Amino acid sequence: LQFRDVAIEFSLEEWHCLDTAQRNLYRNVMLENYSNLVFLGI
Amino acid sequence: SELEDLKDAKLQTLKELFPQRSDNDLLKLIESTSTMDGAIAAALLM
Amino acid sequence: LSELEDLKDAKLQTLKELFPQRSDNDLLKLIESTSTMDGAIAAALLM
Amino acid sequence: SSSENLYFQGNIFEMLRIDERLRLKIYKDTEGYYTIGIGHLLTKSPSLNAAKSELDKAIGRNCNGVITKDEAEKLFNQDVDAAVRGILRNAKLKPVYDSLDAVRRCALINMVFQMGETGVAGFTNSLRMLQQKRWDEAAVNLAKSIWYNQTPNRAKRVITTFRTGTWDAYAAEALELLEHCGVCRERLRPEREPRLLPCLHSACSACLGPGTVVDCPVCKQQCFSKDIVENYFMRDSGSGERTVYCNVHKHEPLVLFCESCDTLTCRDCQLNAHKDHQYQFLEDAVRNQRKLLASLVKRLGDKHATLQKSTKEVRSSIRQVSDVQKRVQVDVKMAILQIMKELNKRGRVLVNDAQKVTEGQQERLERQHWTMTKIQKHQEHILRFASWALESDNNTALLLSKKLIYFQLHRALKMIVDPVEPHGEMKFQWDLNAWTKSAEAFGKIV
Amino acid sequence: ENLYFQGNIFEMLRIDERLRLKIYKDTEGYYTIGIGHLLTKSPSLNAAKSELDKAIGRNCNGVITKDEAEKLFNQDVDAAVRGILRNAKLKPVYDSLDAVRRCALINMVFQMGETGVAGFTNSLRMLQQKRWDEAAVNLAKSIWYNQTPNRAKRVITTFRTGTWDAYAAEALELLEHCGVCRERLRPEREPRLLPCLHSACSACLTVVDCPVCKQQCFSKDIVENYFMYCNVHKHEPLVLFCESCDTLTCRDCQLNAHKDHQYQFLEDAVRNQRKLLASLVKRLGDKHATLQKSTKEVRSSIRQVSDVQKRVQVDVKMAILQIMKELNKRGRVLVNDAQKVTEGQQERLERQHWTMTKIQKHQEHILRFASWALESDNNTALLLSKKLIYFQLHRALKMIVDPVEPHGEMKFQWDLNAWTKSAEAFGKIVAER
Ligand SMILES: [Zn+2]
Ligand SMILES: [Zn+2]
Ligand SMILES: [Zn+2]
Ligand SMILES: [Zn+2]
Ligand SMILES: [Zn+2]
Ligand SMILES: [Zn+2]
Ligand SMILES: [Zn+2]
Ligand SMILES: [Zn+2]
């Protein structure tokens, strides 16, 4: 179970469809998914 | 002639779109479809 | 008999070792206000 | 639009078809390179056979020097697609392309198609001017180039397109081309025996193949050869208007217009072959014939204007469905990220629930370990000392200090250590399968 | 024989590094404070003070507290361990070593830095291969050993054996040294023994607190550490035990000051006290043996409680990643479903654009030709061309162009409140006794 399985990426076309809150929500989760994986090791 | 003139209009439209199909094949597509767009889509398939 | 005075002494000496710069007066009060040795030690740790 | 008699299907493919005549046989261009089809280069080294080999390779067929038009069209679309990608991946061309309207984008693609993305990137001062508009200025700077001197007729058309943003230079060439063979582009002088096909494309008689039927070289529409007529407008281009004579009564000129048969006739045919149907003399008939035709043109131009609007509507619908797709992709990804957030929030809660238990037990066990350790240190200090004092031969010192030692030995022996108390355990529990099936069946897509 | 120690890295380093609360220069002239904590190699005392202030978080004119020293000590001990683990040459060795020998390696790194210790290439290799006696001999030739030989010998013995005997032996040795300055307690130091069996130079001391323990005694209870003769008569030995007064006395004091109280001869008091003390010591040693085992149990319980907490954190985090994986599996499907619809709609729209474009090309071809024909002055050519032009004009006017259909929009649909409530109720932590 490596990161790709839980990673989400936005294309440039999609990125410009995101408002401020949406770009931050994305940060919250992606930063936190990373921390959980660092702890777990996979 | 009420609808015969429409059938001919559809035929001439297809002939312009598909220049090397016989009038009989193009008429058969018109008969088997309900719209101009339909006949064209079927013609593109052939 | 005076069993509790020997026990009190044993508890006091245990606390004096663990809390070397507390007065015997403070250490006896927390012994008397608690039930077990661990109880008294836990009380002493709150200063 | 600007339709004196100016019409143009304004896009890159139609633009290039005018700039590049179709050649179905390998030919040498004006720099000596072997090319084929619609502006397609086979080889730069002047090889006899590299050109034939690259032709066979590009097509996938044994092409002695010949391809089919379909093959030419396949190469052409590939080559246009290639020119466009070359712009997009190029750091200097891409930002300019993006800034341009569709007409001017085609003018830029035209240059790339002709010269390559590296050559076009070289026109740095002109590219800058265009990104800033300065259309008249870019036009002037581009006319100072080698490109212009080598191919001024094309450069003038491309430059006019950059300058005006219109298609007039191409509408004008499309008009000029009515007077040139649809196949070889030779001007249709009478020496070429120009012929007009029923689809109003015309060609040198020599440029037509096989009563019998002929396939139009331009547009492929088929007709009977008996229906092909002289292109009389061009037939007379080398002299001025000529009396035409009857195909049968070969000494009689055509002087009447038969309205019932909608064609010119000589006196003998109108009197005999065409007896009892309607006519006027040529100069009388022509005024009404010009009015009927001009009126149909007005009607067709109106229909054309409607179709142009209809086509623009379709392009907008295309951009819309594309944007709905992007909306859905974003909505889906944000929906999942939103759920991920709540899952991580619950994760933190579950851990804090476990941590609440653990901190309680650990505070206790750590307190006891601290007690046991500090009591043990005392015990080892007293045992270490008492043994040392006894290892000593100094009996005087031993007795003088026996009081202090004895006290600490008894004191350590009274020390109270409550025993190690046990601990509960905890385990995380959840339904993998119920959650997997709520995923998998999450949502839709209406 | 009587070897006791409390074998861990912290007690190991406390034996080796005397606590200093004021900035001092070590043997290389470097500025140090606390328990072996290097402030700087810079020759500037102010640089040392700046580094001290930086480390503590306050303005220390070169002085810290014991609590502050302890904090640096724990940071530095942790730092030594990280240095070992991040170093390609030290980690394989450390990993291969037992807990006691690991403390020896940490001791060295604490003292010298990870690269200094990594420099001992062959000795490290020997240790990983468990060639203990060879490693000892080789390490004993080093600059380290020549610079701090007693420490190096203790560390090396710890590597040779798997034990703490070297440190138990130093703790015994230290009874003969001052509890605070660690100078040997010769008579010139006026060595004094406190009731808690700690000793100190009188210089380092009604009531007094022990420098080592923080515990109080009456100064009247403090005696000369006599292990390192009469206090009344300048030429007399103490030879009698004044049993009446529980103190040793000389001939003249027993004859006068204590005339005929009660007494035993020293030889009588000696044998008896040594039998009594010896038995109290055996009893204490047995109580100690019991406490050692009960402590091993509390440690095991502490590790177990910690391991349970880690287990739950892992189970929760993995449970969530697994669900996340399934949500993205579904996300990909949801998008692909949408894309099929979009491709269908775009297939239609492009077909319709292709049709309109191609019909337009015809319209422009006819409009252009007919107009050109009419600009011409050649009335004969025009009339000859009329049948063909007219025909195409009417044919173009008849052509059918279906209008664009409204094609409705698709939307992504899901239940946000349902999923937030499922997540809020996700999982359970189950306790058992
Ligand atoms: Zn044609
Ligand atoms: Zn020709
Ligand atoms: Zn007639
Ligand atoms: Zn005739
Ligand atoms: Zn001292
Ligand atoms: Zn002490
Ligand atoms: Zn005396
Ligand atoms: Zn006496």
Author numbering:
A (entry chain D): 4 to 45
B (entry chain C): 2 to 47
C (entry chain S): 1 to 47
D (entry chain B): 16 to 225, 243 to 478
E (entry chain A): 19 to 223, 244 to 266, 277 to 481
What does the paper say about this structure?
In tetrapod vertebrates, Krüppel‐associated box zinc‐finger proteins (KRAB‐ZFPs) and KRAB‐associated protein 1 (KAP1, also known as TRIM28 or TIF1β) are key repressors of TEs (Rowe et al, 2010; Helleboid et al, 2019). Once bound to DNA (all but a few), KRAB‐ZFPs recruit corepressor KAP1 via the conserved KRAB domain (Friedman et al, 1996; Kim et al, 1996; Moosmann et al, 1996; Helleboid et al, 2019; Tycko et al, 2020). At its target DNA loci, KAP1 functions as a recruitment platform for repressive chromatin‐modifying enzymes including histone H3K9 methyltransferase SETDB1, heterochromatin protein HP1, and the nucleosome remodeling and deacetylase (NuRD) complex (Schultz et al, 2001, 2002). Here, we report the crystal structure of the KAP1 tripartite motif (TRIM) in complex with the KRAB domain from a human KRAB‐ZFP, ZNF93.
The crystal quality was improved by deleting the flexible B‐box 1 domain of KAP1 and adding the CUE1 domain from the chromatin remodeler SMARCAD1, which binds to the coiled‐coil domain of KAP1 (Ding et al, 2018; Lim et al, 2019), to the complex. The resulting crystals allowed collection of X‐ray diffraction data extending to 2.8 Å resolution. The structure contains one KAP1 RBCC dimer, two SMARCAD1 CUE1 domains, and one ZNF93 KRAB domain in the crystallographic asymmetric unit. Consistent with previous biochemical studies (Stoll et al, 2019), a single KRAB domain binds the KAP1 RBCC dimer, near the twofold axis, in the central region of the coiled‐coil domain. Contacts with KAP1 are exclusively mediated by the KRAB‐A box (residues 3–44 of ZNF93), while the KRAB‐B box (residues 45–71) is disordered and not visible in the electron density map. The KRAB‐A box backbone is U‐shaped and contains three α‐helical segments: a single helical turn at the N‐terminus (α1, residues 6–9), a short central helix (α2, residues 15–20) and a longer C‐terminal helix (α3, residues 23–43). Our structure of ZNF93 KRAB bound to KAP1 reveals that the interaction is mostly hydrophobic in nature, with a buried surface area of 1,108 Å2. The KAP1‐binding surface of the KRAB domain is enriched in exposed hydrophobic amino acids and recognizes a hydrophobic patch in the central region of the KAP1 coiled‐coil domain. Mutation of the highly conserved Asp8 and Val9 residues in the KRAB‐A box results in loss of silencing; both residues form direct contacts with KAP1 in the KRAB‐KAP1 structure, with Val9 buried in the hydrophobic core and Asp8 forming a salt bridge with Arg304 of KAP1. The RBCC domain of KAP1 in contrast displays no significant conformational changes in response to KRAB binding.
